[PDB]
Amino acid sequence: SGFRKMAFPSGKVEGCMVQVTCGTTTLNGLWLDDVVYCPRHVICTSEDMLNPNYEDLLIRKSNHNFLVQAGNVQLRVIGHSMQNCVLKLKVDTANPKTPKYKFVRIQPGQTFSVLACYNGSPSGVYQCAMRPNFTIKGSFLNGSCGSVGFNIDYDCVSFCYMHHMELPTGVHAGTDLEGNFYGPFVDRQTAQAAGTDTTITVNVLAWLYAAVINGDRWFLNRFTTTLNDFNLVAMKYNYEPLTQDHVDILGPLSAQTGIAVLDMCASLKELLQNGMNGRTILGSALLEDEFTPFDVVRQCS
Amino acid sequence: GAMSGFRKMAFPSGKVEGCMVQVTCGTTTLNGLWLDDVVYCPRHVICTSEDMLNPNYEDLLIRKSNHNFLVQAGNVQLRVIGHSMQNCVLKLKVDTANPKTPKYKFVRIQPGQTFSVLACYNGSPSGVYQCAMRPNFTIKGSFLNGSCGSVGFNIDYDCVSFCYMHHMELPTGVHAGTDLEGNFYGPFVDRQTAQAAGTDTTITVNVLAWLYAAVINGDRWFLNRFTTTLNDFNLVAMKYNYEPLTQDHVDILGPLSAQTGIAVLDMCASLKELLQNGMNGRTILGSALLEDEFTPFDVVRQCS
């Protein structure tokens, strides 16, 4: 018993963090083999910040304009190229601490750990979900530009996120490691705001399944609902619509507990319309939406 | 501002991951911490499930020799060359100093203080979380199976301060353990006897620190124009299962009071009203709950 949110152990990623400086701009970089990956906006001046022509500005940078520091060791930049919004700096030394890794793109609702860094130095690690509006909850004190998000499967680090900007609403926005933004954001200094956020329904259902596996069953009811009737109610509460894909993903939890997904949906519907009525689920008075069905299957099954 | 949407973070766990090993005595396997040439682990590794009701640790340990302990670091077996018990911790001297030993210290913490736990199974790190030692001396730990020997720590400028080692799971799912000198936190024993955590309370000084952080960040909706005496606040707070606030706690909040221009007792009156009204929809620093696992030490440092 005891369902606590956990980040992946961050050691494998800590070994990859470096400091990248271009002129007056300093941020974090990820050093894998002989390449350092970082946000392409490291090359921006205040003059450039509004409507920059990145590829044109970059071909006019000499390698030595890039200062890469790994601890007390300076790495020499021998090449540079841009891949979407990510800058790739080829260095003269392969990182001896490079773990087994892959670059993956995640979907909103999926979870990962972020190793928050400042000036190439790891500060802390936290677990989070990509929100349905493609932002990540977090402050200026939860890491700066170039900090990365990842999952670990067996001994392999799957890098899924790189922080590009902190928005004014206490959330950050960024890209995958191939430089493709998550969400309708751009790497320019312009008025950009996160869209209205919604609750990740499939994760709340996974969390209710976690509560059942842990013997917290007070909210279970005898009813079922259709997927359409549930979605009609859920959307009135700013919950994401549930898809057949989400129903399929919850399949193993349904089979393990003997509670069909649309049976658990009827429990959630009752919780939304009537509240918790002075009760808790897994010791919490609020419904948790940053645990995926896989996080539940991994921690307790 | 700086803390809008603040998320609690654990310390980067790399320096501790390099210290985790698997310790086996007969049929019992758990985690050990390898620092220099010593492996630290719960002394109950020498117990069977049967021994756990009434273990006589001195009698069980005298019967062991160095060769009864199997220590594995990855795929490498470490040779045990000595063993001694220090309170509830077993110390195994090994023939190899850990080359990954970080700069470290052993410290004993107080209830309300925070630390990170690197949850491990069979000497392998599984996850990391941030927590506080509860006022009832327990920790709200992971779902679990074989995490005994997993440790709690803080990191200050590349020095790891080890403050906790997991020993037991209590019937309420919470965890109990010791410091790295083997002294239990709370009135618990490394024995499978009827042991129950006392009623847990909210860490008031941490909630107040969080409210000051919210004010520094321009989130002021919960403030009121009242002040309270320290005793009137404690009379109300205790009705809500909040820890009583002491003059030490009032002193600790001093720099936050000076930075915001809000006297501690003035913030106390605001908390008293929050407890009365509740946070039904509203958020503070982007969170729907009153946070009690963020200390004044960290708020003062993050809000210079």
H or E segment to which residue B251 belongs: helix B247-252
CATH of residue B223: 1.10.1840.10
* Reported resolution, Å: 1.6
Beta pairing class for B175-178 and B159-169: antiparallel
Enumerate chain A positions whose Cβ falls within 8 A of a Cβ in B: 1-12, 14-15, 115-116, 122-126, 128, 137-142, 168-171, 214, 283, 285-286, 299-300
Per the CB < 8 Å rule, is A138 touching B5?
yes
Q: Which domain, by its residues, includes A75?
A: 11-91
Is residue A183 a contact partner of residue A135, using CB atoms and an 8 Å limit?
A: yes
Per the CB < 8 Å rule, is A2 touching B125?
no
Q: Nearest C-alpha of chain A: how many angstroms from B6?
A: 5
Is residue B84 a contact partner of residue B41, using CB atoms and an 8 Å limit?
A: no
**Short-list B298, B292, B196, CA closest to B237:** B292
Residues from chain B that touch A171, judged by Cβ atoms under 8 A, are: 5
Which of A5, A112, A125 to substitute to test the interface with B, most B CBs within 10 Å? Answer: A125
AA letter at A278? G
Helices H, strands E: what count in chain B? 8, 13
Residues from chain B that touch A122, judged by Cβ atoms under 8 A, are: 12, 14
Helix H, strand E, coil C: the string for A263-275 is: HHHHHHHHHHHHC
Q: Nearest C-alpha of chain A: how many angstroms from B67?
A: 31
Place of tokens 């170039």: A146
Both tokens of A192, joined, read 């950009």
Q: Nearest C-alpha of chain A: how many angstroms from B262?
A: 24
Place of tokens 């998550």: A182
Other beta carbons within 10 angstroms of residue B99's beta carbon come to 6
A20 three-class SS: strand
**Sign of the alpha-carbon torsion through A18, A23, A27, A33:** negative
Residues from chain B that touch A116, judged by Cβ atoms under 8 A, are: 9
Measured distance CA(B112)–CA(B20) in Å, rounded: 26
Q: Which of A16, A22, A38, A41 is catalytic?
A: A41
Measured distance CA(B15)–CA(B151) in Å, rounded: 12
H or E segment to which residue B117 belongs: strand B114-121
A145 is catalytic: yes
Beta pairing class for A86-91 and A77-83: antiparallel
Which of A1, A288, A297, A299 to substitute to test the interface with B, most B CBs within 10 Å? Answer: A1
Residues 6+ apart with CB under 8 A from B156: none
* Distances in whole angstroms, Cα of residue A170 to Cα of each of B95, B151, B222: 51, 32, 19
A112 three-class SS: strand
Residues 6+ apart with CB under 8 A from B6: A138, A139, A141, A142, A170, B213, B285, B286, B287, B294
Instruction: Give the number of beta-carbon pairs within 8 Å between A and B.
Output: 118
* Distances in whole angstroms, Cα of residue B179 to Cα of each of B100, B133, B146: 22, 12, 19
**Sign of the alpha-carbon torsion through B193, B194, B199, B200:** positive
Experimental approach was X-ray
**Short-list B257, B246, B288, CA closest to B111:** B246
CATH of residue A78: 2.40.10.10
Is residue B85 a contact partner of residue B57, using CB atoms and an 8 Å limit?
A: yes
Measured distance CA(B11)–CA(B5) in Å, rounded: 18
Is residue B230 a contact partner of residue B264, using CB atoms and an 8 Å limit?
A: no
DSSP notation for B165-220? EEEEE-TTS-EEEE-TTSPBSSS--SS-S---PPPP-B-HHHHHHHHHHHHHTT--
Both tokens of A13, joined, read 């990623």
Residues of B taking part in catalysis = 44, 148
**Short-list B252, B174, B249, CA closest to A283:** B174
The β-bridge partners of B160 are B104, B155
B248 three-class SS: helix
From the number of C-beta atoms within 10 Å of its C-beta (0-12, 13-18, 19+), residue A140 rates as middle
Both tokens of A44, joined, read 């921006």
Alpha helices in chain A (DSSP H): 11-14, 54-58, 201-213, 227-236, 244-249, 251-257, 261-274, 293-299
Q: Nearest C-alpha of chain B: how many angstroms from A128?
A: 9
